[PDB]
A paper describes a structure:
The E. coli Paraquat Inducible (Pqi) Pathway is a putative Gram-negative phospholipid transport system. The pathway comprises three components: an integral inner membrane protein (PqiA), a periplasmic spanning MCE family protein (PqiB) and an outer membrane lipoprotein (PqiC). PqiC is predicted to anchor within the periplasmic face of the OM and comprises an ABC auxiliary lipoprotein domain (formerly DUF330). Interactions between all complex components, including stoichiometry, remain uncharacterised; nevertheless, once assembled into their quaternary complex, the trio of Pqi proteins are anticipated to provide a continuous channel between the inner and outer membranes of diderms.
Consequently, we designed a second N-terminally truncated construct, in which residues 1–16 were replaced with a hexa-histidine tag and TEV protease recognition site, referred to as PqiC17-187, which was expressed cytoplasmically. After TEV cleavage of the N-terminal hexa-histidine tag, the sequence of PqiC17-187 differed from the native processed PqiC lipoprotein only by the removal of the N-terminally acylated Cysteine (C16). We therefore propose PqiC17-187 to purify as a monomeric species in contrast to the octameric oligomer of PqiC, implying multimerisation is dependent upon the N-terminal lipidated moiety. The PqiC17-187 structure, solved to 2.1 Å, displayed an arrangement unique to that observed in the PqiC structure with three copies present within the asymmetric unit. Two of these chains, chains A and B, sit in orientations similar to those of the two corresponding chains in the native PqiC asymmetric unit, however, the third chain, Chain C, sits perpendicular and slightly below the plane of the other two, interfacing with the bottom corner of chain A. Despite this global geometry change, the monomers from each structure align strongly yielding an RMSD of 0.568 Å across 151 pruned atom pairs and 0.591 Å across all 152 pairs. Whilst the density corresponding to the first residues of the β1-β2 loop region (residues 27–31) is more clearly resolved than in the full length PqiC structure, the electron density for the extremity of the loop (residues 32–44) was mostly absent from the 2mFo – DFc map contoured at 1 sigma preventing modelling of this region. Despite this, the electron density corresponding with the core of the protein was a considerable improvement over that of the full length PqiC structure with side chain information clearly defined in both β-sheet and α-helical regions. Overall, our PqiC17-187 structure provided us with high-resolution side chain information throughout PqiC, with the exception of the β1-β2 loop region, confirming the conformation of key residues of interest lining the octameric pore. Consequently, PqiC17-187 monomers are able to adopt a conformation more favourable for crystal packing thus, the molecules within the unit cell no longer assemble an octameric structure.
Author numbering: 22 to 31, 45 to 187
């Protein structure tokens, strides 16, 4: 059978999330060696990964930022903007999942650029658990971004 996977979806405009080509295909990515990434043929994203990363980012930030309106749509001219590149979002042969990239926040004219690289541990086999753990780590990255925002005026 074919299986499809979704990162669960639980002023600030999350303008865009970019992924490179190898993460932009239909299949979920598994790193089988130190050099090789494989796109699954029968275990696919239920919608393109950059869209899922963007939507889950909006929802996770919304739960992390009470008093804020976080959206994937423009909200107002004075809004903060958040642009994210995700360069790694995959499982790995050693049971780990890797989530890394860089975000760029424009908060009232201040540009804040922060790299991120986080790891999770897959306690069960299968693409089910891999996607679960990746979603959890992505939510941790949203919490980190919201913590930086709450330290701003």
């Amino acid at each position: 059978n074919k299986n499809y996977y979704q990162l669960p979806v639980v002023l600030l405009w999350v303008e865009q999330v970019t992924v490179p080509d190898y993460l932009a295909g239909n299949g979920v990515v598994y790193q089988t060696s130190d050099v090789k990434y494989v796109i699954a043929n029968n275990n696919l994203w239920a919608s393109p990964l950059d869209q899922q990363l963007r939507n889950t980012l909006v929802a996770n930030l919304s739960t992390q930022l009470p008093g804020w309106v976080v959206a994937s749509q423009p909200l107002g001219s004075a809004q903060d903007t958040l642009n994210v590149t995700v360069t790694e979002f995959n499982g790995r042969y050693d049971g780990k999942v890797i989530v890394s990239g860089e975000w760029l926040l424009n908060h009232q004219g201040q540009l804040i650029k922060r790299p991120f690289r986080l790891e999770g541990v897959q306690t069960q086999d299968g693409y089910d658990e891999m996607v679960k753990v990746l979603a959890g780590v992505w939510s941790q990255e949203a919490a980190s971004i919201a913590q930086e925002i709450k330290r701003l005026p």
